[PDB]
Write a protein that binds this ligand. Structure first.
Ligand SMILES: [Zn+2]
Lengths: 123, 38, 47, 134, 74, 52, 52, 121
RNA sequence: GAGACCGAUAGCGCACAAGUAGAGUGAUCGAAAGAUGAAAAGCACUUUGAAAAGAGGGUUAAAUAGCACGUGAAAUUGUUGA
RNA sequence: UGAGCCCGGGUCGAACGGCCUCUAGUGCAGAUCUUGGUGGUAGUAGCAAAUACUUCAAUGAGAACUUGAAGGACCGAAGUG
RNA sequence: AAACUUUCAACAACGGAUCUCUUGGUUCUGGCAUCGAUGAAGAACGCAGCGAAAUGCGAUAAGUAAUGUGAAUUGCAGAAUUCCGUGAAUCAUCGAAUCUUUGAACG
């Protein structure tokens, strides 16, 4: 169904994952980190986060996080490397890129127009 | 232990027989409400 | 002798004997604070 | 209005009986009407449906279409009419469950038992018609 | 352990010293039963099992305990 | 063992040197019948047992 | 039914425990254990002034 | 592999035993050859099992009919042939003993039995 | 056979494989749990993915009904807008 | 005036309402109320001791805790047999 | 200015309230009287082509005989039924049987 219903489905690409076993708070923080970016920039950034070359800022769910110079890229002090959330977002972004390839859209001019993380039923 | 009786052995076999899963064709029967073993 | 136990922390909402090893114990609450104040005001009124 | 104390107007009991009826009671329930030509031929209104009957579907999405009964599936109170099928996703055709009250019988599968059933129904109807007339 | 299996009622409740079932009292002919436990009474009352023969009695009563075969049966 | 030997003799005409029995965990009995040297186990299994 | 709400074994935990002074079902191996009973405000309990 | 109840009723004891033996032998052999490629052979085995049950029922029924004819005019019958009814009904007084009445009551009823009468409005 | 009764936190503890799962050495204690759709017609085929699944496509009056299934509140949460 | 009543837009799919009487298991913010669900605390407290691990290669989508070889340690017959 | 905290809205989540339904419960009324040594109630183990529970049955084992009905069962697989017939059926009735180990339980 998707939250952003104002986008026509013939001109965009989409991806979804449900009941994903990963931290909701960290996943939200890294989604906000990659929100509004171009696809290649987001993919490279997520790989760098996995490699601990760049870190995502922790904005809201940031209790007792160490300070790192990498956070200066965001104008913040609390940065962290959510490896698992980064891998999950890489999987969904690659699925969305594959859907764009199938639909015939240009992959070099795609931006992350909408990204959302919600809470799944607790286990 | 190693020392037991054929009756208790048969009871353990029956316990396993209850501790088997459920059949897919049972699941596919019409009017069926059985989903998983309880 | 009788040790008084507050029903807070690990002792809040427990069925019976807490971890306190003793002959006789007594659970207390603020509800019991008000009961105790009522009993003493009745006693003072009687006296 | 009911008079005999044996019968009950209980919705609960009526639905329980309908949905837990055995196969013979289900057959009697899935009785179906006869066509007009058969009506003035046999003096019979309705008869239980069976596998060899030719029926005409006159209710449902299938407007006025004929066919031989393929199977009387007594378990869910439906019958299968030949060539009245829908394709699944895979393209395999599955029969559509149709109800005997929605079908009407055009050609009737004949044997000794059904000839006897028709004779009994006709005998009762004509006896009562004669009694009412004179 | 003070309780093994009882052959009459099937519960792991026969004392191994007293040799008496704490649930039914197996060595005694009667089945243990008390009126202060309606839940136990309704746990082990008639109808909680198989009804081997008492389930078949009522139809024979209905037909009147009649014996024989139908006339003309092969 | 006596009943098993008698059954294999009378029904399927099999002579057995000895029989060893066990009870499987499920509750059925398994019998190993070691036959006489004259007869051939492969031939008997192919003929009377329908086993390859 | 006159037996409705009373087919249970419940006893109040006490006064000094930081829980409501209500009868609670004994046991310890089910959801029903520790839950309130015997009251008109409790789930699966007796109704106020049962109909006669 | 279906045996007919009417044919079994027509047949006598020796033929019934012969058919039972043939069915048992066939069932054993076909089970042995069934354990591999159990199929329509399984259907056939179900058929012979039901047929064996039917033949056994017919043999038992004929034997019981013969025994009842033998004990037709005897005071004590086997407990299997005695009617079941209920334990209380079996313990109950017979119809003759329940209807038996004293001679003086019989005389009183003979000479003063309930009369038929009516009272005018 | 009935009712100016109750309507899934109600009504018997049990509308369901409930005196069941489970707890206790034992006497005993003892739950939670109903609803797709008229009909499974319960998604063929293509593509991404190790897979779970996703995206096209399709069934249906409806998938804003996908067997986490009638309708789908609040508490609480995410995204966007101010 | 008010408790409330009525309409529009969206969702939904099978029953419901006004008026006059009758009837009651009829109106909630509390009861350390009952049942269920959900938050802040919080990605916080925390995930112990048994000295110890390392290189190459293999399987696998993925290898610190899966394997083979090589090292470096240990139980030390009152054993980690 | 962004971020963060908070307010409102749209959509999407969590959760299962409301409305609707009900092969269930509860209460009342009416006809009738029927467990067991001819082995009861209860407990156990077996039995289906593919079944664990529930249900049915007892080595004749999801059953046999008989009577009636009259063309099925159904999730799949395999056989039927000649339909002008002693005859399908997880059918109904039911007068005949089979009825493992125990349990008043009885070498
Ligand atoms: Zn006992």
């Amino acid at each position: 169904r998707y939250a952003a219903t104002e986008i026509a489905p013939t001109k965009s690409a989409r991806a979804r994952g449900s009941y994903l076993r990963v931290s909701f708070k960290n996943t939200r923080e890294t989604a906000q980190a990659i929100n509004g970016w171009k696809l290649q920039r987001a993919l490279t950034f997520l790989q760098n986060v996995i490699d601990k070359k760049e870190a995502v800022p922790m904005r809201r769910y940031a209790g007792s996080t160490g300070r790192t110079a990498q956070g200066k890229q965001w104008g913040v002090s609390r940065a962290r490397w959510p490896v698992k959330s980064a891998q999950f977002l890489i999987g969904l972004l690659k699925n969305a890129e594959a859907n764009a390839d199938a639909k015939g859209l240009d992959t070099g001019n795609l931006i992350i127009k909408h990204i959302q993380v919600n809470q799944a039923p607790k286990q | 232990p190693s020392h037991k009786t054929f009756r208790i052995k048969q009871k353990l076999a029956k316990a396993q027989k209850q501790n088997r899963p459920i059949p897919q064709w049972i699941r596919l029967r019409t009017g069926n409400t059985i989903r998983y073993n309880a | 002798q009788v040790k008084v136990v507050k029903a807070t922390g690990a002792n809040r909402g427990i069925k019976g004997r807490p971890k306190g090893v003793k002959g006789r114990y007594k659970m207390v609450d603020g509800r019991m604070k008000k009961e105790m104040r009522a009993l003493k005001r009745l006693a003072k009124k009687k006296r | 209005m009911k008079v005999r104390p044996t019968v009950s107007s209980s919705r609960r009991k009526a639905r329980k009986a309908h949905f837990s009826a055995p196969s013979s009671v289900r057959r009697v329930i899935m009785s179906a009407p006869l066509s007009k030509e058969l009506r003035e031929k046999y003096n019979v209104r309705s008869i239980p449906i069976r596998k060899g009957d030719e029926v005409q579907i006159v209710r449902g999405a299938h407007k006025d279409k004929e066919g031989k009964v393929t199977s009387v599936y007594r378990l869910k109170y439906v019958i299968h009419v030949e060539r009245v099928t829908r394709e699944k996703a895979t393209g395999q055709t599955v029969p559509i469950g149709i109800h005997p009250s929605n079908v009407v019988i055009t050609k009737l599968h004949l044997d000794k038992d059904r000839e006897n059933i028709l004779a009994r129904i006709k005998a009762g109807r004509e006896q009562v018609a004669k009694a009412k007339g004179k | 352990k003070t309780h093994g299996l009882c052959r009459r009622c099937g519960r792991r409740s026969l004392h191994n010293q007293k040799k008496v079932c704490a649930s039914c009292g197996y060595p005694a002919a009667k089945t243990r039963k008390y009126n202060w436990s309606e839940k136990a009474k309704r746990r082990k009352v008639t109808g909680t099992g198989r009804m081997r023969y008492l389930s078949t009695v009522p139809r024979r009563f209905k037909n009147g305990f009649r014996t024989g075969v139908p006339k003309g049966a092969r | 063992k006596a009943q098993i030997k008698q059954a294999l003799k009378k029904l399927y005409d099999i002579d057995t040197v000895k029989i060893n029995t066990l009870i499987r965990p499920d509750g059925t009995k398994k019998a190993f019948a070691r036959l006489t040297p004259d007869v051939d186990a492969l031939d008997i299994a192919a003929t009377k047992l329908g086993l390859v | 039914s006159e037996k409705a709400g009373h087919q249970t074994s419940a006893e109040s935990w006490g006064t000094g425990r930081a829980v409501a002074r209500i009868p609670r079902v004994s046991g310890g191996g089910t959801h029903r254990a520790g839950q309130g009973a015997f009251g008109n405000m409790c789930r699966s309990g007796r109704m106020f002034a049962p109909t006669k | 592999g279906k045996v007919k109840a009417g044919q079994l009723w027509s047949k006598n004891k020796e033929e019934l035993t012969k058919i039972l033996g043939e069915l048992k032998t066939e069932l054993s052999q076909l089970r042995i050859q069934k354990i591999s490629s159990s199929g329509a052979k399984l259907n056939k085995i179900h058929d012979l099992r039901k047929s064996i049950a039917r033949v056994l029922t017919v043999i038992n029924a004929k034997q019981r009919a013969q025994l009842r004819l033998f004990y037709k005019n005897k005071k004590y019958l086997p407990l299997d042939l005695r009617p079941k009814l209920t334990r209380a009904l079996r313990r109950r007084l017979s119809k003759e003993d329940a209807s038996r009445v004293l001679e003086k009551t019989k005389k009183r009823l003979t000479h003063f039995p309930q009369r038929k009468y009516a009272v005018k409005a």
